[PDB]
A paper describes a structure:
We constructed a structural model of the flagellar distal rod by fitting the crystal structure of FlgG20 into the previous cryoEM map of a polyrod and a new hook model using the previous cryoEM map of the hook. We, therefore, conducted rigid body fitting of the FlgG20 structure into the cryoEM map (EMDataBank ID: EMD-6683) using UCSF Chimera, and compared it with the previous model. We found here that the elongated density can be assigned as the l-stretch, as is seen in Cj-FlgE, considering the structural similarity between FlgG20 and Cj-FlgE and the amino acid sequence similarity between St-FlgG and Cj-FlgE. Then, we constructed a new subunit model of the distal rod by connecting the FlgG20 model with the D0-l-stretch model built on the basis of the Cj-FlgE structure. The new model revealed that the l-stretch extensively contacts with the D1 domains of other FlgG subunits and thereby reinforces the rod structure. The l-stretch extends along the D1 domain of FlgG in the −5 position toward that in the −10 position. The l-stretch also interacts with the D1 domains of FlgG in the −11 and −16 positions and thereby mediates the 6-start interactions of the subunits in the −5 and −11 positions and those in the −10 and −16 positions. Interacting with the −5 and −10 subunits, the long l-stretch of FlgG fastens three adjacent protofilaments in the rod. In addition, the l-stretch mediates the 6-start interaction of −5 and −11 subunits and 0 and −11 subunits. These 5-start and 6-start interaction networks make the distal rod rigid in its straight form. Moreover, the tight interaction of l-stretch with the D1 domain in the −5 position may stabilize the upright orientation of FlgG, forming tight subunit packing in the distal rod.
The axial structure consists of three morphologically distinct regions, the rod, the hook, and the filament from the proximal to the distal end, with a few minor components. The function of the hook is a universal joint that transmits motor torque to the filament in any orientation relative to the motor axis. The rod is a drive shaft that penetrates the peptidoglycan (PG) layer and the outer membrane and connects the hook with the rotor of the motor. The distal rod and hook show distinct mechanical properties, although they share the same helical symmetry and repeat distance and are composed of similar subunit proteins (FlgG and FlgE) with 39% sequence identity.
Author numbering:
A (entry chain A), B (entry chain F), D (entry chain G): 1 to 51, 65 to 260
C (entry chain a): 1 to 51
The structure:
C-alpha cells in the first residue's frame, strides 16, 4: 500500500538521480582540471520490533561524491597554457574582490595590461603584463621570468605560489571550473610549488577531466535497466491496486 | 526528466559547437597570418544543499579562444609580398576612413597610383606609387626605398610603422583577415618595426595560418564520438521515457 | 577512453614534432657554420597508488 | 544480474587498462634508457561452499610491471653524450637539493660553468666546466680527464661513480626519465663504474627504450578484440535484461 508506494518512490528517485548524475558525468569531457562526481546508494534506519524482527528502510543516495584524480592532458604549446603535474591548485581573484581556485591552462591580458584569466579574471597575486616582453619563459614554481625587448634577461615579472587544502571534496565548483574555500574544503596554504603537495608549472599545456565514459556508459545502461525494473515494480503494484479496487 | 533533458541538451550543443569550431578550424588553411580559435568546456555554479551534498550544473563552452602563433610561411619572391618575422601588425585604411590591421603579404596599386592592398584598400600611412619606379627595394622597417627611372638611388617613397597592442585576443577578424581595435584588443602603438614587439619587413614573402590539422582531425573524430555518446545518452533517456509512458 | 585519447594525442604530437624537426634538419645543408638540433623524448611524472 | 554486471565491469576495466598500458607502451619509443611496463591479469579469492563447490572471483590486473632490459642505442658521437654498457645508473642533483637517477646521454653547462643535464639539472658529484677545456676525454669510470688550453694533459676535472640498487622495479619515473630511491627500489651504492653491477662510460652515445612494437601491436589488436568480446558479453547480458524486463 503506502509501503510499496514510498519504496517505489525512493527507488524511482534514486535511479532517476543516478541517471542524471551519470548523464551530467558523461557530458563534461574536455572540462579543464575536472574531478567527477558519483552518488552512493545507502539505507536508512531499520525498525526492529523484537530480538530478529526488523522492518528496514532506505535505498537513498547520500550525495554526489567527487573523484579527485588527474584526468587526460593535452600538449598545446602556448605560454598562456600552464598545466600542473600532480596536485596543487591555482589562486585567482574574482572581480568582486574574492579569491578563486582552479586547475586552468588559459590565461589572458586585459586592456590595462594586467594578468587575468578566462576572459578577465585577475590572478592572485596580480601581475602586470608589458608589451615589449617578447618571450615568456615561466619558471616551474611561479617564476614569470619573461624577457623584454632590449632586456636580454629572464626578468621575473611575477611570482606565484600554489594553494593546498585538507579535504578537496569540500571545495565546490562555483562557475566555469572555479573553486572557493568552503567549510569542508580545508585550510588554504599557498606554499611554494613543488612542495607540500604542490606540483610545478608546465608551460604549454592544460589539464582536463577525469571522465571515464565506457564504464559510465555501462553505468548508464544498468541505471536505465534498474529504472525499468523499478517501473516493473510500479506496474505490479498498480496491477494489484487495480485488481483489488476491482475487488 | 527535465534534468536529463537539459543535460543532454547542453552536451548536445557543446559537442555540436565543438564540431563546428574544429570544422571551421580545418578549412582555414592558407589563410594569411591567421590565428586559430578553440572552445573551452567549463561548468556552471554547483548547488550545495548541505555541508557535501551538491547538485552540479554546467558543461558549457565559454568562447572560442584564439591561438596567436606564427603558422607556416611561403617563399613567394614578389615585391608586393611582405611577411613579418615575429610579431607586429600592419595598419591599413578601410575606404570608409577607418583603420584596419592584418598580417598580409598582398598589396596593389589603384588606378590613381596610390598604394592599396587586397584589391583597393589603402595603407596607413598612404603612399603614392609612381610608374617610373623600376625596382622596389623595401627597407626592413617601412623604408619604401624604391629606385625610379633616371634616379639611381633607393628613393624612400614611404615610411611605415608597426602597430602593437596589449591583448590580441580582443582583436576580431572583421572580414578577409582584417582586424580593428576593440575594447579588449589593447592600446595601439605604431612603433618602429624591429622594436617594442614589432618585427621587420621580409619583402618577397607571406605569412599564413597556424592550422594543425591531424591533431584537430583527432579532435574531429573524438568530437564525433562524443556526439554519438551524447546520442546514446539521449537514446537511453528516451528509452526510459517510452518504457515509463508504457507504464 | 580519455586515457587512450591523450596518449594517442601525445604520441601523435611527439611523432609530428619529430617529423618537423628532422624535416627542418634535412633542408639546412649549406647553411654556414650551422649546428643542428634534435628533440629528446622523455616521460612525465608517474603516479604510484601502492608500493 | 549483479554477477554479470560486475564481471562485465571488471573485464571491461581490465581490457581498458590493458589498452591504455599498451597504448602508452607504444608511444614511448626514443625515450632514453627506458624500461617498459605491462599489466598482469590475476584472479581474486574464490568462494568454496562445499568440498568442490566454489564461486570464483577476479580477472584483475595487479599493476604495470617494468621490464628492465637495455633497448636500442644510437651512435651519436658527442662528448655530452655518454651511454652505459650494461647496468649502473647515473646520479644527478635535482635543483631542490634532492638526488635523481637516470640512464641519460644529454648533459649541458649552465651560465655559471657547472656541469648540469637536461637543461639545468646538476650532476652528483658536481663538476665545474671551464672555457679553455678544449677536448673532453672522458674516462670509462667517471674520469672527466679533459685537456685545457695550454695544458697538454688529460686533466681529471671530475670523478663519477655509478649508483646500484636491489630492486629497480621499486624505482619510479619521476618526470622526464628521472628516478629516485623509493622503498622497494633497494639500497643505493655509488660504486666504481665497471664493478658491482655498474657498467662503464661510452662517450658519444645514448641509451634508449626497450620498446618492442610489433609484438605489442599484436597485443593492441588482441586487447581490442577482447574489448569487443567483453562488449559482446555486455550485449548478451543487456539483451537478456531487456527480454526479461519485457517479461
Amino acid at each position: 500500500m503506502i509501503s510499496s508506494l514510498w519504496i517505489a518512490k525512493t527507488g524511482l528517485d534514486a535511479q532517476q538521480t543516478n541517471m542524471d548524475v551519470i548523464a551530467n558525468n558523461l557530458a563534461n569531457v574536455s572540462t579543464n582540471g575536472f574531478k567527477r562526481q558519483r552518488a552512493v546508494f545507502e539505507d536508512l534506519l531499520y525498525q526492529t520490533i523484537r530480538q530478529v524482527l526488523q522492518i528496514g528502510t532506505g535505498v537513498r543516495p547520500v550525495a554526489t561524491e567527487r573523484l579527485h584524480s588527474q584526468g587526460n592532458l593535452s600538449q598545446t604549446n602556448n605560454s598562456k597554457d600552464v598545466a600542473i603535474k600532480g596536485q596543487g591548485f591555482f589562486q585567482v581573484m574574482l572581480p568582486d574582490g574574492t579569491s578563486a581556485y582552479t586547475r586552468d591552462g588559459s590565461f589572458q591580458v586585459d586592456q590595462n595590461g594586467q594578468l587575468v584569466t578566462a576572459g578577465g579574471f585577475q590572478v592572485q597575486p596580480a601581475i602586470t603584463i608589458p608589451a615589449n616582453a617578447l618571450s615568456i619563459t615561466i619558471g616551474r614554481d611561479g617564476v614569470v621570468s619573461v624577457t623584454q625587448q632590449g632586456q636580454a634577461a629572464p626578468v621575473q615579472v611575477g611570482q606565484l605560489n600554489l594553494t593546498t587544502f585538507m579535504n578537496d571534496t569540500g571545495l565546490e565548483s562555483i562557475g566555469e571550473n572555479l573553486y572557493i574555500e568552503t567549510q569542508s574544503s580545508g585550510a588554504p596554504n599557498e606554499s611554494t610549488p613543488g612542495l607540500n603537495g604542490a606540483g610545478l608549472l608546465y608551460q604549454g599545456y592544460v589539464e582536463t577531466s577525469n571522465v571515464n565514459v565506457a564504464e559510465e556508459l555501462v553505468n548508464m545502461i544498468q541505471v536505465q535497466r534498474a529504472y525499468e525494473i523499478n517501473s516493473k515494480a510500479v506496474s505490479t503494484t498498480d496491477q494489484m491496486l487495480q485488481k483489488l479496487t476491482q475487488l
